[PDB]
């Protein structure tokens, strides 16, 4: 079933150009073929953090943790808990450590 793994990478790549409605069409394919699987909601939560609506993604990750009760869905249980951390990650990070010279934004303390 590897086509459904490269079609979600096409979705992320389309959000990386600005083709947001074709990128949404790629998550919508997953829920079109799998209407009741939490995989499709995990890819909608991905699309929301790739369209800058992280306030929806922090709620939708809680909604997807409600799809975890069996040994069929232990991967889903990890998948929405890292999606929740990385929604808060993508909104809350600023990449400035304000100390040393290990990474930094460009310039800052090496000019």
């Amino acid at each position: 079933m590897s086509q459904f793994e490269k079609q979600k990478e096409q979705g992320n790549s389309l959000f990386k150009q600005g083709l947001y409605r074709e990128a949404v069409h790629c998550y919508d394919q997953l829920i079109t073929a799998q209407p009741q699987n939490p995989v499709g909601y995990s890819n909608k939560a991905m699309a929301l953090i790739k369209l800058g609506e992280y306030t929806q993604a922090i709620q939708m990750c809680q909604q997807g943790l409600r799809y975890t009760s069996t040994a069929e869905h232990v991967a889903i249980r990890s998948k929405l808990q890292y999606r929740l951390e990385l929604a808060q990650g993508a909104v809350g990070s600023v990449q400035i450590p304000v100390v040393e010279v290990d990474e930094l934004p460009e310039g800052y303390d090496r000019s």
Binding site: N12, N43, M46, A75, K79, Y82
Partner: peptide
């Protein structure tokens, strides 16, 4: 378990 960057 990770899915999309």
């Amino acid at each position: 378990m990770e899915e999309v960057d």
